[PDB]
């Protein structure tokens, strides 16, 4: 059933743009629920308008559950399986198992479908974190469960066409994109353990019928095992594009490939053993395990601190190369007309307050000041809804023509670039209002608009959330209209469909071999990665699994 020879010699080009369109679909219907949530956090009850316009929506909380799952869980994993298979693919000029990269999409698809149905019909409105005792349909804890395991297919695929390539190429260090990709996918295996343990061992027995209750401490001390590295799971495909494709959209070179390895290496070692940072306010977990976990989280920040110097060093060198001038001429020198450039560069800027917020959340006792306030969705919109979501958006404008001929028009370029700026400016304004609101104590996950008189001190950041709501609709509407317009043209020109993935040269230095070589002992680093997990999680997960105090699940909705 294939054809136009571009899609012939590379049919994973097809296996990519399917993932990359289910992932966008999910992002569309999720982000609809979004401006409705902003108006709320700006004391404006726009839910009459929603229940008329989507009479299937029951509660404020139904949509947040959709907002959560479709955006953070679903949009991101698929964009991750797109970029992080198809990249070690196009680099290596090899073909991923064409059969297995289809046990993925189907697998994910019906797994998505089997979760979509009970959510769509009020049966698992337990928010994107399903913390027991809240319980939902068997089909939810089945669907999202099948959906995540889809990734295990990805780990094999990629490890596989790595270990293939290795054999044909003895003595030759692993390629940059593939190296990225291999530590990435390994780290995620070691991390999916939790959300699968909790799914098999508790969520599925409990929800099918075979136990009457789950222990909340462990369901949650397990959920966060995964819950944390999964955001570094959503991050690194974007760090992929930024270290290896963005310096050339800029007119430059990735200045140090050893560093752009050391970062990924470091995410392999330290993304998983951290979850207590989400449990600072839980009982029945020791202050010293929280503390070892605090300090470790402050370390999962070093590779991003470094990511900052390397990416700036790089954009700046590109900028000087086009005649950029004094201390700041280089910003003005860059291609501020290519949304594939503008998109992830605006996201990187919003990332400076996001990471700062992160470094507070991590700081053990300081999480008491802002835990479960609006400060937290303030922090993570700057991280996943702005940086991560934006890179992707802007990577429809170089990754899309490179997957189905259809080129990008100067009508489309100028709508890709207005979309991107409004969604960035929207996000910043929501950052202020949400951070400021949390500091004034406004809770998170709350229909506060129904209690319009309870947070008088939040008067002025509430005006900010309203502005940010309007603006993200004007950007969500132009982006929907936009996303169809590109991949609903006839147009299919197959030439820029074989213009090879626009990677970057890589200012090679003498220091490269001792360093690179060291980090290429993948198998060994993977052994350190799963010993840190055993040192951090074991003494607790085991003085726990031998103290289980399970409890009836409740449906309050």
């Amino acid at each position: 059933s294939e054809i136009s020879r571009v899609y012939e010699a590379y049919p994973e080009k097809k296996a990519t743009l399917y993932f990359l369109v289910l992932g966008f679909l999910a992002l569309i219907v999720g982000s609809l629920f979004g401006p409705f949530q902003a108006l709320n956090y700006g004391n404006v009850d726009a839910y009459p308008l929603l229940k008329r316009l989507l009479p299937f929506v029951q509660s404020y909380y139904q949509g947040l559950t959709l907002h959560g799952v479709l955006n953070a869980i679903v949009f991101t994993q698929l964009f991750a399986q797109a970029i992080m298979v198809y990249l070690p693919a196009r680099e290596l000029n090899m073909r991923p198992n064409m059969g297995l990269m289809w046990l993925s999409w189907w697998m994910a698809f019906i797994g998505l479908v089997v979760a979509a149905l009970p959510l769509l019909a009020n049966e698992a409105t337990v928010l994107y974190t399903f913390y027991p005792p809240l319980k939902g349909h068997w089909a939810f804890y089945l669907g999202a469960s099948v959906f995540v395991l889809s990734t295990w297919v990805s780990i094999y695929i990629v490890l596989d066409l790595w270990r293939r390539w290795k054999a044909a190429n003895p003595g030759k260090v692993t390629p940059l994109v593939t190296y990225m990709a291999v530590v990435f996918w390994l780290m995620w295996f070691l991390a999916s353990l939790g959300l699968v343990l909790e799914a098999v061992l508790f969520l599925l027995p409990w929800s099918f019928g075979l136990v009457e209750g789950v222990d909340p401490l462990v369901a949650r001390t397990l959920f966060w095992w995964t819950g944390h590295p999964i955001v570094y799971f959503w991050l690194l495909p974007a760090y992929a594009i930024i270290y290896t494709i963005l310096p050339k959209q800029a007119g430059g070179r990735l200045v140090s490939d050893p560093m752009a390895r050391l970062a990924f290496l470091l995410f392999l070692l330290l993304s998983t053993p951290v979850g207590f940072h989400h449990q600072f306010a839980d009982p029945g977990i020791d202050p010293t395990w929280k503390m070892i976990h605090s300090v470790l989280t402050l370390f999962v920040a070093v590779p991003s601190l470094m990511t900052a110097f390397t990416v700036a060093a790089s954009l700046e060198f590109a900028g000087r190369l086009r005649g950029g001038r004094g201390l700041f001429g280089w910003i003005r020198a860059l291609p501020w007309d290519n949304p594939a450039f503008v998109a992830p560069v605006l996201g990187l800027l919003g990332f400076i307050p996001g990471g700062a917020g992160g470094i507070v959340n991590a700081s053990f006792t300081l999480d008491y000041v802002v835990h479960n306030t609006a400060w937290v969705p303030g922090h993570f919109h700057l991280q996943v809804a702005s940086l991560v979501t934006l890179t992707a958006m802007g990577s429809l404008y170089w990754l899309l023509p490179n997957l189905t001929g259809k080129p990008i028009s100067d009508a489309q370029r100028r709508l890709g670039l207005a979309v991107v700026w409004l969604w960035f400016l929207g996000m910043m304004i929501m950052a202020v209002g949400l951070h400021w609101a949390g500091l004034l104590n406004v809770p998170r996950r709350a229909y506060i608009a129904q209690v319009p008189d309870a947070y008088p001190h939040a008067a002025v950041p509430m005006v900010f959330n309203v502005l940010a709501g309007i603006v993200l609709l004007v950007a969500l509407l132009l982006f929907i209209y936009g996303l169809f317009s590109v991949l609903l043209s006839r147009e299919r020109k197959p030439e820029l469909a074989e213009a090879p993935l626009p990677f970057a040269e890589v200012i090679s230095g003498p220091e490269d071999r001792r360093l690179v070589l060291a980090m290429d002992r993948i198998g060994f680093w993977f052994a350190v990665a799963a010993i840190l997990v055993v040192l951090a999680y074991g003494p607790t997960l085991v003085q726990l699994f031998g103290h289980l105090n399970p409890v009836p699940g409740w449906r309050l909705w």
């Binding site: 601190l305 900052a308 110097f309 700036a312 060093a313 201390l327 990471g355 700062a356 300081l366 802002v370």
Partner: protein
Amino acid sequence: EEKPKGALAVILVLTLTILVFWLGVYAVFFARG
């Protein structure tokens, strides 16, 4: 060609931002203690 002075200005902005979030939320914390 020299001092990547510009990249230095960006990690300086990052640094100042990390500092004022941290030190800001650090006082708020004692204020409520």
